[PDB]
Amino acid sequence: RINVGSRFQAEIPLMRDRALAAADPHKADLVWQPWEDLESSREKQRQVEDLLTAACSSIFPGAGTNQELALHCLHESRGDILETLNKLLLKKPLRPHNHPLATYHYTGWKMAERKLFNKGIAIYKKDFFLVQKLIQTKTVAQCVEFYYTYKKQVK
Amino acid sequence: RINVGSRFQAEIPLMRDRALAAADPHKADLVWQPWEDLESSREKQRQVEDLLTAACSSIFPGAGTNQELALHCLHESRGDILETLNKLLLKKPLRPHNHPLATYHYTGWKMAERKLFNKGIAIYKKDFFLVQKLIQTKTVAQCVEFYYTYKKQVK
Amino acid sequence: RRKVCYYYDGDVGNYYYGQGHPMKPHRIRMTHNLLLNYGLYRKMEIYRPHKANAEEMTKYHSDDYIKFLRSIRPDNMSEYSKQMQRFNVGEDCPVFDGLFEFCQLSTGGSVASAVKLNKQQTDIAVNWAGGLHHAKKSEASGFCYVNDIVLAILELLKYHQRVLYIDIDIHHGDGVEEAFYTTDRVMTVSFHKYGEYFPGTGDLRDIGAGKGKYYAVNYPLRDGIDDESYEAIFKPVMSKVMEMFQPSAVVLQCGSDSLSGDRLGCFNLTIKGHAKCVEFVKSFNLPMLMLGGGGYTIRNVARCWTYETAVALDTEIPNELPYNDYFEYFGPDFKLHISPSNMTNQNTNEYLEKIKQRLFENLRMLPHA
Amino acid sequence: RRKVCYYYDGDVGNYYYGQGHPMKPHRIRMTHNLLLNYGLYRKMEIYRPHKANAEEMTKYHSDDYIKFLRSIRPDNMSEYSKQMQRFNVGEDCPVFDGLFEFCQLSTGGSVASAVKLNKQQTDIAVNWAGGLHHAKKSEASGFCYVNDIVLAILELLKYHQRVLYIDIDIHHGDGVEEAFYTTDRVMTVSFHKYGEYFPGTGDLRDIGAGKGKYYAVNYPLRDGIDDESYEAIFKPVMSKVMEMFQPSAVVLQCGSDSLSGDRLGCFNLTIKGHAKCVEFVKSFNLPMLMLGGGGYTIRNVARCWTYETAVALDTEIPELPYNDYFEYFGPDFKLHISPSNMTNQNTNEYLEKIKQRLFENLRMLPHA
Amino acid sequence: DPAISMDLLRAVLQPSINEEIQTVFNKYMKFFQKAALNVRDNVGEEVDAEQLIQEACRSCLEQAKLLFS
Amino acid sequence: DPAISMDLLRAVLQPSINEEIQTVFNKYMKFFQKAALNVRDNVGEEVDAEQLIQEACRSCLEQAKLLFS
Ligand SMILES: O=P(O)(O)O[C@H]1[C@H](OP(=O)(O)O)[C@@H](OP(=O)(O)O)[C@H](OP(=O)(O)O)[C@@H](OP(=O)(O)O)[C@H]1OP(=O)(O)O
Ligand SMILES: O=P(O)(O)O[C@H]1[C@H](OP(=O)(O)O)[C@@H](OP(=O)(O)O)[C@H](OP(=O)(O)O)[C@@H](OP(=O)(O)O)[C@H]1OP(=O)(O)O
Ligand SMILES: [K+]
Ligand SMILES: [K+]
Ligand SMILES: [K+]
Ligand SMILES: [K+]
Ligand SMILES: [Zn+2]
Ligand SMILES: [Zn+2]
């Protein structure tokens, strides 16, 4: 109930600590910034919406990518629209950006490995360890991702 | 029939006269030149025709001027079209061009002086001297010009 | 106006606990898409949280309990049978791949949001990933592993005069209560189900010790609470508290498991009722820190947090949903706001006046003039 | 290809002679619009002629005859009654304002075109304003005042080896004949009406004098000549002439009064017939100088000269565009026309007469 | 639809291109201004001058479509 | 019909403006070229890459008319 030994660990609080060389140059990495000097005047807000659904159209996928690939890139310019299309038209935006690493962070396939799913799950139905064992290239993290996306394909 | 005294006046002909410092720096004044390097390729010939009837439209008259005012001006540039419209848009092309003098040479009115015509010609009908006498500002040259132009106004 | 900060990482949605377990952290992923699809991205900062190291973990827990988390694997689950039961790891805290890495992000998230408030240049921050409070020093408990809420608070305590903690979650915040039970600058309020419910504590006498009397409050309740029933008990105390406690920093644990349609809960709440709370807290204009926590109906959870996120901006967002990937999961109505169940209130008006008639002048014992 | 030069001024169209007079130089104005409306402006040089001074006028006429033209006015017409009849000024040469200034331009025009041929860098030039040949030294005659054709030729004679003159005009070119009647380097051909017609000369015996025999030719004819009838007499002589005369410069007076529908003429010509002539002359590729002259049906005149102007460019031109003087072009509004119903009154023996006689007469001249 | 995705790209690039177009016509607007005045001077005051200028500008772009017909 | 004068003023000026328009689209053609292939990569080959480019370029001109309406 009230375990005296498991209460606390000498927090040592001061409650002023004026300018104690504040932390987080690394714990938090800014990836999006407002802009309301020119954009948010009820004149150019819609200009970004037309861009938004433009990505969710007949354009290249990276792993299956509707709009989220593009929003992180607009922050790269901080005030522009067309500069993104220069690098979006580029062969890959995934590869040449390795220091930011966000390109792989957004979302986290072969017919053969897909063949083993109906052969894998449809038999044991609750294993979740032979699932990655017999499909070696994919992890249980990736193997779970298809389950949520597959739910639309029935209807 | 054959008057010996009125035959000739010592022509003194040679029929070679190689390089006798040929005359006509003044007897003939060039006012129009072909151009067939870019124009006459059956691609831009029509471009000048559309210009031509453009003058014979809702644009300023000088004395009654359909197209002839514009053709003498194109020779001024010798290869251009738009440079003429700069000076054609100008307040008058008649006044600022006084050395070439062609502005007055093309074609060569008040209701009061027009009133005296039906009062002038319709009475005597064959005078041609009281015509200029009672219309003092105009000459017999100008008074004749309206006769040819008036022939359409009946029909 | 007020600047706002929001935190998120993408790898959380892939973690899985095990068969039939109700907690599934994929819920956080659906919320993130809603903030962007509604256009609210124009009005907030997004941040990526990095992995939390054992350093800040050792600041509350033992360094040997941690080394056990590194040596465990699901394939070698059998060798550690004696230790597993010893630390409550089991049916309520199953073992799986990436168990530690899951907590690294939730720990890193709130601890990161702690600092930009310590920077003292903004008022509001949010992290729906955290909200784990049932953990103890040497044992997991109640589906939680790390009491990251306290670990985030320790950065605040160094800078901030007084920190008020709140726990709307239908589960009782016993873990946080344990760490501030004899100190005056930290008040611990907690509204919770009482009577045959985990963790089985939270009576009226749970008041404090030493100087801690009238500094760790509770206000237990029973099932069937209505949105309007909530009104007569939340507002009057808080107005009495602000001149009394003189807070400088709020920490509002928005436990969304208290909403209707819950596998576990039996309350009668909607989105408007729980969201009606925050408009009153925002009225005071003080440094806030919103956190999530419990919640097992993934459908209604994102509907609540997305609304509360807009309310911190004092912005309106209309009722309805745009084109998105997770559209069909939002019930057959496909409307943001919802209705409650048919349950009535089981608490009498005298049952309301009980602690109200008793406790308001009890607080007047404290010094002020 | 061959470069071409054309001359024109605008003040000519305002001049007027008097009541009921057939010559009216407004005809030149209508021709000028047609060259531009047909697009031929792309292929030729236009030049403005300046006023001709008394200097070049004194080169043939007397300086006192000129001073009379300056002192005359229509209001003071009466004082000079004795002198007026003395110089043939009268019904055929009325007096009017700007009489001298009219001739200054026609004199300046051909005299100007004379030089660019003397420049010896082009072959062809045109001036439909000139073509006045009936004038004499001390008198006007036959509606003309100045024999500018000769005044233009004198610049050519200095530079050009031999100048062939031609006169298709239904009137006879007696004035030009008078000035080259005893010189061999100038041949003077002239086809004309003969028998009760102005100037009442131009018989077969009008041949020359001294060395001038077989160097000033005529070939008179009667009314009703057809376009095809013209063919059998123009071509055969010219082919015989070129090796014989050895010309270096042509002067083709395109007297257009010889066309049908004339107040004065009684020929049976069309535009194609008179224009058929020039294609044969252009075939020889020699320096030409085209001039106008007579013509009193203003409607068909411009139809002829505009065609001949295009033929010097060996270009085709098809009907009429939008213009100011459109309605004057008859009820047909077609460039080419038809003749009257007159037949030829000249017998085949009448054709062979000078042909059988004169071709070997020319063979008397030296060549081997 | 394939053609729709291009039209969503069209809305992005419209304002940038529309700015340069407005710069083009300003060079040639001087010819249009006096032309509208003189026509109204000769025909009569009743004609709205500014409307005529707008009519020609839309017509100029119609023929530019032939580049990509 | 006073507007006849304006249509002939246009014919003088249209071939000149068509030089500058071609200069403009050549800047943005780099966006269309590789993009159209990528559309033909995700969809079959039956669609012609050149046709869609000609379609949108004509479509862009229609919207610019609003400035001079
Ligand atoms: O069969 P339904 O009436 O549609 O309800 C199911 C069911 O929930 P209940 O068991 O509480 O009815 C599933 O639970 P299990 O069958 O897995 O025990 C649950 O799965 P989770 O409990 O793992 O969430 C699933 O939810 P989901 O569709 O999100 O997988 C949910 O379906 P609904 O969400 O449509 O109610
Ligand atoms: O009455 P129209 O059919 O229009 O013809 C007349 C007529 O010519 P005809 O007598 O040959 O028909 C005039 O001749 P007169 O009445 O003077 O004898 C003539 O005048 P000129 O002979 O003095 O030229 C005039 O011509 P213009 O209009 O140039 O004065 C001309 O009219 P059209 O030129 O309209 O045919
Ligand atoms: K609670
Ligand atoms: K306390
Ligand atoms: K003759
Ligand atoms: K001779
Ligand atoms: Zn909870
Ligand atoms: Zn004649």
Residue numbers in the entry:
A (entry chain D), B (entry chain F): 722 to 829, 833 to 879
C (entry chain C): 8 to 376
D (entry chain E): 8 to 325, 327 to 376
E (entry chain B), F (entry chain A): 62 to 130
Question: From the publication, what sentences describe this entry?
Answer:
Class I histone deacetylases (HDACs 1–3) are essential regulators of gene expression. The enzymes are recruited to chromatin as part of large multi-protein complexes that control the acetylation state of histones and other chromatin-associated factors. In the MiDAC complex, the large ELM2-SANT protein MIDEAS (1045 aa), recruits HDAC1 or 2. In conclusion, our structural and functional studies of the MiDAC complex reveal a striking molecular machine whose architecture appears to have evolved to facilitate processive chromatin deacetylation.
In all, 126,484 particles were included in the final ~4-Å map of the dimeric complex with C2 symmetry applied. The structure of the dimeric complex has an overall S shape. It reveals that the ELM2 domain from MIDEAS does not mediate dimerisation. Instead, the MIDEAS ELM2 domain interacts with the DNTTIP1 dimerisation domain which mediates the dimeric assembly. The consequence of this is that the HDAC1 catalytic subunits are arranged very differently, located much farther apart, with the HDAC1 active sites on opposite ends of the dimer. This is a complete contrast with the NuRD complex in which MTA1 dimerisation results in the HDAC1 active sites being positioned on the same face of the complex. The shorter helix in MIDEAS mediates a tight interaction with a non-polar groove between the end of the long helices of the DNTTIP1 dimer. One of the regions of MIDEAS most similar to other ELM2-SANT domain co-repressor proteins is the ELM2-specific motif which binds in an extended conformation in a conserved groove on HDAC1. Density for the InsP6, but not the SAHA, was clearly visible in the map. The dimerisation domain of DNTTIP1 is critical for the assembly of the complex since it interacts with the ELM2 domain of MIDEAS and dictates the relative positioning of the HDACs in the dimer.
